[model samples]
Target: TPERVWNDFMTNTGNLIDQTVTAYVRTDANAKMTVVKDYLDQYTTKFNTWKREPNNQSYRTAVITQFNLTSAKLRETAVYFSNLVGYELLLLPIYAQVANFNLLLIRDGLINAQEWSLARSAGDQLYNTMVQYTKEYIAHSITWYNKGLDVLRNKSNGQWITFNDYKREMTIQVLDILALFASYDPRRYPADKIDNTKLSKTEFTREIYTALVESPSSKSIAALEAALTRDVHLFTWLKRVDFWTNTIYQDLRFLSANKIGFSYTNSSAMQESGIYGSSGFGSNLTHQIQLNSNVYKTSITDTSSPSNRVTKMDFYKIDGTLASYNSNITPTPEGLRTTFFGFSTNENTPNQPTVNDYTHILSYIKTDVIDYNSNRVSFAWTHKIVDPNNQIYTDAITQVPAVKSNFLNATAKVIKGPGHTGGDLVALTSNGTLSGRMEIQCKTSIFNDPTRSYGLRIRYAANSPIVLNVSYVLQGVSRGTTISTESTFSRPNNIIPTDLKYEEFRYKDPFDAIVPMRLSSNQLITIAIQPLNMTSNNQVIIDRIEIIPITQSVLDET
Candidate 1:
């Protein structure tokens, strides 16, 4: 059994992961077409041949035999970047500690002015070093990742699906490791906390500024070293290896400075099904499905177990057979949760057209559970098979260009500067008159989610607050404008072919406003912003316009 387990691990997990890592590393970060071609050709040949005869004795024997030597090379290949990068990271805590420790000593009169000056200089040096290392690592990793994409494209014959899969998997790996490094925070030194002291109010305030510099409480070099080595182990030296050498560091840095933002919120609700029964029947859960030939094993676990004792699960197949399982029913704080896999032959489903020419078999799993009252219950979660190609999920907010507008008594143009979204904003100024028009045309069908309600959010900046009157029309009928600062308007799913016409400015402070509306697919919406009156500080700088999705949760705000 041990021999077979080892064999499976080597052939599947070890071999598969190593191949992916090797492919990633071998492709040069700064590669030209010719260099990339040679690496791609070699890797593709090796991968395909291994895939073709995966179970062959001689081929596997050679692979396993060279494993020791190849592993050494793999480690060495990674050190080309890792050792240098790790060194930079390892020094970070020490430098950070030294600077803060210096501040502590100076404020307490434990050191001279010269000593404090030296510490400040050291801190500046550390900052400079950090910038260089972070930038280099980020630049290298981004280029390498792009190069690997080209190689993967050639290997998979330009299949976008394979590309997407690899992208998702590798990105998760990178993020997990980066998260580990960024989360490491050494305990602060006790002297750093200078509170409730015998100093005057002004002196304490001055000390507060000094306390901003941080150092570990255990200010010894050995202690900091122990903390760094213990917490930040480059033990998974593969991705950790590539991550160090690559520009992945820069990615993390940019993310750190900007605190990279996204608008999408994940839903915890399980995906529902229309074909299968909504809830399990009676005391048992069952769903008709067939295992794909590619799916080797079915792993089942009960997350909603009621007790800590071993959970005995009886799995019944649709063919009128049952398998009682009790192995690996591990106990947790929640309850007893079990994980087990069952293997079976692929059976064909009757009277159904095949997906990707694979016959679907009519199979289902029936399982039982017990609640607190001893009544039978079912799994709160269920797995359903669906066509992966049918991707109707929409998440991103579509930001419309603000400069693309028709003007009447105003001139609008794009100005590049510090922006709310991107590095530019739109400057719309009134020309000595009122009734300014910013006509925008939007086709609703461009949005993929038909179930979600859509609204508009206009982000703008001005010297003073100004209210721009907006009007909406569906087809030929007018949906009157809201006069108040906050109002919800309802219009038909037809084309909103009205201009955002303004009569005069109202508010004195710059503010972004959201106007909610119901939109339907294939409908055209024309919007215009009209200024009511003009003032000396009347130039409205439009940052961006976001098409916001108003889900049920959002509608609850009303």
Candidate 2:
């Protein structure tokens, strides 16, 4: 029977009556109906304009995409005067007199606008009055909806009908109004900017409708929470608008287009390369110069004794001829011999001497030259008193008797001098005085054989010392025929000693010294020594002879 009643209501006659009743109600409530229609129409038109205009492309696209999202919502309110009683029914008369009363209030000075010209002043007043009226109408609409719901809920016939269901119907009606509004272009009402606030209203309704449909069961709780969270009371509805128009819809649109990259732990790569290795057998000097395939030839041989008086022998030669040589005593196997080409100070020997009396022997022979085509040279040789009772000196031929042999036809020149006594040595030349000495004292033992002697070789000058002269004689060559050049050593500052016994020397700005020494065609370049300042008592025992050839131009340029 109820289904048949619903069918009767859905038929042509009942539908026509319903439409007639709705039209008549609207006509009777013309003022309120016009206000609602105009507000919605203006808002819809502007929204459409914003979406379609090229200038507002980004905003329009965002709004449209957001509005079409799953979470989008809309809502409305309808008041029935017949259902209202006593004091509540007064709202009808109040609504009827709203416009007229607002005008009167402005005229009576209850409300005022800033004075410009008379026309402008009146227009502003009217505009402000309408704004106030519109606000009051919106408030009244909410009140009516709430009051109607209250009355319907309290009625016996409306029992068991939940508040949520009533709210849903109201929200749906608001959503329908918003849908109608969004269908039009806002630009059509070019001079009607005052109605723009209605756009916000439409958005708010949409949001409320969405919330209602999505969580109908929790509508009351959600609405209460929203009200507690917002600062402005009316913003409860506006928040829904924001949710639908901004947050909710925005996230949905971006979901498909968003991209994310995987993150990994941060790290850095570092590398370092240098000569690092353990000492080899015999001496720590094996690692001094890293031997590679680049090295051509190398030989370490002992030739003679320190006391065996042998005629001077040239040390270095290019091929067979002796280019340069040293006339110093040849270090014997009994003494310190040429065991290693590069020697580190750290090495074990039999002699337990406080002073190092070592001699490095260098020799090269040439038989064809009668006038002595070669020269003699030596490096790292010294004789000092280190535990005289022990008789353990680093001298060549320590166990053998001294002998004299004719190695070269030319007489060898021996520059004899005393060793240092912990003081600066002054070398006196024709030009000036050179003061400084490179000492090699035992780092570990003073009277015992050196177990490990690792020390630094420092060359520094005082009082602006200069090289002044450098001379070298080749093997098989006369002394006068030897190539010689004068150069100035970079006068670096002295290095103050921290540990006196340990050989310590520092230069402020140490640089290479350009010494010009020519090589022979027959001899390999051999023993080379830098004759540093040797004081009256201080002595420096040296080792590891380095022979470097230089061009005349390079020396001159330096």
Candidate 3:
């Protein structure tokens, strides 16, 4: 009877926990879910066998033996998992509670000054309890995690765990614990609850940017910035196994890949628009965006300045065959047909925006002549912005096109964006026909300085997926081409802004199409955004085109 009760308790508790905790953390609970289910199946099988033949002592012994082993293992796992939930995963609930009470009211304008004054007193009490509970939970976490460490060591007692294995695993566990502690700070919950913690209803931007906050409120904003630096360490320290599947590891990666990192206020770091001059690109000459054959670089030596940057580049053909190595500054006869001559800079203290922050800079050498020569050329390059330890995410391929033209044309009526006094923008609906197309003209004095390089970035919204064909034509000669599409609905264009962030809007800021050649001397280059016939609701809204100053000398000074 006691065995049956134990079985029911573990089964119900595990099932309930799998369901409840899955809501809090992004980690896949299914594997852990299946583990509990499998463990229950074992017990159930043993119990069923014993019940069927109660007269047999052997069946009873097997069931009892199973219960003993299962109970012991579950106890050990519970210690480790408890620390994970109560300590690491507890931040989600803490924020959810406060955000609902404070931000929801603040956002909907439901909380007047009088209401806020009354609510603030009540809010303080709730906030105080949260602070107290978090303090206690953190202490409980340390004890539980220490106990978990011992459980792990004891469970592996029969197995071979060398000193290095212990060292590595201990390092990993400590890093995870450190990351957990860094993430959950009760002080980050604003005493006034002004919704200062950067949040989106969608968690993608919020989770990664949470680490970038300086201190909650201003204090919380400052607090988050420190955490942001610490986040880099957590990311760089991930094990190969963890990098493959760990949820937190994947979030940490969001910082590195998308040009999101500790930005220097005035570093030489800038994006080189993939646009290249193609007038000289004769028949059979072309350009492409590709993935590198070798997904990552294991080692990279650092550089002092742009002049001294070390380089590693491999050219690949359209058929997935290697073409040539970088031959500049070498006797390799000038990879006369090289795809791109790029120099690489590894992660170093000098290049780091923050002294402790990790960074890698890669600057590609561009030439005026485009020379693939109908030559075998499919393109690929590893975005070498990561460190040696975290090579698993090395395939930071720049597959994004050089530029995206906003859907611009006549017959499109102007409308206002969302908000009080919303910005005016032109809106167009695709008729699923070629006659209805859009074009953005470059006619401003902003491009007057022929020596100055400028970039075009569009801010806009769309109801459904739309594709813009970006083509570069100079002197009526087509040089290069690419397409920009709102392919995925991961972040929808028409997101209802929470109004929590000031000066932030729901418009998607598409690609930066840099004028590769100096605009001062060359004639106007035509860029168009044409909708590739969509079945329905293919309306596109254009807010504005930004003229970005991308002059190298000024960029370096900044």
- In terms of TM-score, the best-performing candidate is 1
Q: What local distance difference test score does each model get?
A: 0.31, 0.24, 0.30
User: Which 10-residue window in model 1 sums to the lowest lDDT?
Assistant: 203-212
By descending TM-score, how would the candidates be arranged? Answer: 1, 3, 2
Taking the tens digit of each residue's C-alpha lDDT, what string does model 2 give over 1-558? 111211111122345565564444435555654554554444355445653563565654543343223111111213333233332322333332333223222332211122212334444544454344433443453455456556545544332214433544443332122222211222211112233223211112111111101112222433332321111110000000000001122211100010111111010111111111111221121101111111111222223332212122222211323221122222322432332221112245311111122211111111111111111111111111111121112211011000000011111111111111111122222212342222111111133332211111122222233332122233544221111112212222322221121112112111122322333332321221233443322222221111212223223433
Candidate 3 lDDT, 1-558, residue by residue in tens = 011211111122255564454443424433443454565567668867866786577876776666545444443333444445333332222222322222222222211222323344344544444344433433443343344334433442222122223322322223223222211222221112343233211100001110111111222222322322222111111111100101132211110111112211112232223222222212211123232222221221112221112122333222334432221223222222211222223324221222123221221212121122111111112123222211111111111111122233553444432221112344555444532344433432333343544444444555455665444444565533334445222235544222111112132323232333233433445445445554444655544434444444324433
Tell how far residue 217 is off in model 1, in angstroms: 62
Worst 10 residues of 3 by lDDT: 202-211
Q: Can you tell me which runs of candidate 1 are displaced by over 4 Å? A: 1-396, 406-409, 417-424, 446-452, 480-515
TM-score of every prediction relative to native = 0.26, 0.19, 0.23
The RMSD of every model to the true structure, in order and in angstroms, is: 28.2, 48.4, 25.0
Question: In model 3, what is the error at residue 372, expressed in angstroms?
Answer: 75
Error of 1 at 173 (Å): 24
- As a whole number from 0 to 100, the lDDT of residue 76 in candidate 3 is 36
Worst 10 residues of 2 by lDDT: 235-244
Cα deviation of 470 in candidate 2 (Å)? 83
